[PDB]
């Protein structure tokens, strides 16, 4: 409310609203990833474990920027979250080539958002992108690129052989 | 996939994959509703917590009912998640009367859905429903109608104090 | 001295002079308010506590602004510090209100220096600022005006019992 | 207040007012020597210790004559603090010369207080002075003249180098 | 690589190259530094142990660069180390002014790094820099200036005896 | 200096010298190595950590000499670090081929130095030599061949699949 807020403006109030919808409903094409590997005839645990716990971060990542909504007095507006843009995910390799797009789309908006901010004179928030998103961005980011280059070396190669080896000796599970 | 597929209809099929995009919905409700009652101008840090809860333990529901799918060897399945109904939920009262609603229609959902399993003879979905769902609704359902008497108690007596008392002690903080 | 100092323009040494002044002052008007607070005709020991600790806080605040001008090569100048405006605070909530606008005051301030650091490309001093100060008054400012709804809620209804309950069930104490 | 107030004259209730100014104020001269200490073109840490060890039982002082005003029923009442006396201190031993005059000047304080209660018929205000402060003073005193002796001797014989040994091997850091 | 590479300009890359020169020659200088003090005919420990430890800082300054130029999707390139202006230091003041003014170039380099990421609207490496350096920097030299005033005060008194104590007294071993 | 220095010819002094500078243009080039199989287009990180271990044993071997060189009273002179040879490594087959041509050539080096300690009767330089690098680096190029050998064996059966193999299931990681 009124009572609290200071230094910030509408349409970096907006802006974020618009931020949280993004986040949740990358959050929820994780879902449908991970989901969709662990089908009995896809069944790669490891791939599913690895979205699964994308789709918990991004949205922890929504829970915080509604977290700092609240604490510089604007007000949480929700929309409708669209249907992830693909019902099935192909390959590990088709995968892993829409995570690192949808990820690179979350980037450019955090970037906007922060220019938006720095154009309005607003640190907090700067800093709170810097603080809590940018790196952690920058870093998946760079994992999925290393992830991408593994699965191309092995699927060239031969590729079921290659997609098994990689689910058993890269990721987790 | 058909690999697996055993006496498992695509009437049940599709209503679980319908069953799955209300306790979405639900768990967005709950999002909503808990940074609501954070908001500088509401500020009540017990029944925000409470909601919190209850949007965690809705999108587990979801996460079950998506396991058993697969397990079944049947296809999620991903719809639009529409927006909360209302943008502002009063006070707690009102917010406590609009949870209720929402729980007896999940548990109305969760009863035809047994029923449909009942029809198709599919005892494996009747079980999971009865073992995993319909007594965690009876109980919720029942603790909410205690604190809607609580609230209604207090808030004819005195609103605003009464608001208050309740969030201090009996709500967890 | 000029032995060290680099990229550290008189302006911002004058300014943060000025903002340790600012500091020591809210330091000691929570010192009255703190303990106005404990006096047997007003007796509200969580109220006391809350002040006194806001005092302590702010003290540290001046301290640390102080280390970073001399570890910039900048030189303390002290002025006389004024009395708080105020001989007795009146109600807790006449307190509190007194309180956030002083917090506002104090943010302004901030930003202020934020914006001349900006200006004269320091950003040591701008990050500095971001990473002990920004952040923590945006959390206190937004528990101030949770506490403000929560006494308002209260004292609207019975103005004492309101008062006491408050000081009992949200104050440390 | 009234209610609790019992054999505590107006004239001890001012000067009690009287004392915590000078108590303060002394503080905030020891914040301004200790900081003086830590510049880079003065770089004795052990000294600036020292002093910044001061500043805090000064402060500590003042409020435990806060504390006491309450307990017997008088009002505090704030003035301005006065700016210390100089911007710069000099050498460890123009500095530690400095420190003793003030301390000499608050015993003066406190014994003036002490007769004045005594001709009041005052004992509570006469023991809270012997068993808090006097005793505090003479330590004090004795320990500030030991270190003037001590820095005396050695910076006699070699100025720069007996003011490095003295921070070395007499002052704690 | 172009995978992974968003909102990095070749600009900055480069200049990132060339700050990873600059940390590698500065650690090699202080290689230099630390094993001329452990010279028979210089023989003072702590001096090297100082700047041997200053030389493990700055090679960690330039892997900590390096490891940010390849999450940014930037390209290392490598060129040869000058080897250090001086093949024999003097004093332990001689060698602390060397020092303060290597430290200033690097912190100047940083400072022209930070206003070219501003310019490109590049937040990440902005905050890189006064995350990891920036502050790092600035604690440095305030320590070398202390360092140089004690061995000043030192020297002018008593040149050999000074630089011993200096060694003994204040630096680690 | 001459103070200490006994049976240590000019001869070994300047060849001790040239020892260190190739032993860190080793360290550099392993560096150079290290952070190429890190990019998001390579991203072996096993042989990254192969290599950058690499870095290390190189580099400590250097400062094992510059303290030897100290210990017989010869002076220590820095060259400038000739950049490595190359900018890009190729695959790991490439980059263990090019480790083991340096590492034969600073075998070369060590065991020419040795003969040179042996014709002017140093002993102390020879065990020297044999108690720290002369088994260090007959082990390691041992370890290095048997690399080749098993990553010539998986490259020519299947060459992408073959190099993941490796640095799963033998480097560390
Ligand atoms: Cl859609
Ligand atoms: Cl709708
Ligand atoms: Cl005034
Ligand atoms: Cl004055
Ligand atoms: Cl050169
Ligand atoms: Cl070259």
Redesign the interface.
């Known amino acids: 409310?009124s009572?609290?807020r200071?230094?910030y403006s509408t349409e970096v109030e907006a802006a974020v609203n618009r931020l949280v919808n993004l986040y949740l409903r990358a959050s929820?094409t994780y879902?449908?990833l991970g989901?969709?590997f662990?089908?009995?005839?896809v069944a790669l645990e490891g791939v599913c474990h690895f979205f699964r716990e994308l789709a918990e971060e991004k949205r922890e990542g929504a829970?915080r920027l509604?977290?700092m909504?609240?604490?510089?007095?604007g007000?949480?507006?929700?929309?409708?979250?669209?249907?992830?843009s693909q019902?099935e995910w192909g390959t590990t390799l088709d995968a892993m080539k829409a995570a690192?797009v949808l990820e690179?789309s979350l980037?450019?908006a955090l970037?906007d958002l922060?220019?938006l901010g720095?154009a309005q004179?607003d640190?907090?928030l700067?800093?709170?992108?810097?603080?809590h998103f940018?790196?952690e961005e920058?870093?998946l980011?760079?994992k999925?690129?290393?992830?991408?280059?593994?699965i191309?070396?092995?699927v060239?190669?031969?590729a079921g052989?290659?997609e098994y080896?990689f689910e058993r000796?890269?990721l987790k599970h």
Not at 69 to 73: I, K, S, T, V
Not at 144 to 150: A, E, I, Q, R, S
């Open positions: 409310s009572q609290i200071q230094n929820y879902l449908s989901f969709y662990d089908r009995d005839d829970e509604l977290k909504q609240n604490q510089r007095g007000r949480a507006l929700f929309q409708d979250l669209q249907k992830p019902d690192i690179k980037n450019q970037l922060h220019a720095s004179a640190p907090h700067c800093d709170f992108l810097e603080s940018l790196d920058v870093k980011i760079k999925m690129g290393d992830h991408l280059t593994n191309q070396r092995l060239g190669s031969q052989l290659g080896l000796l890269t």
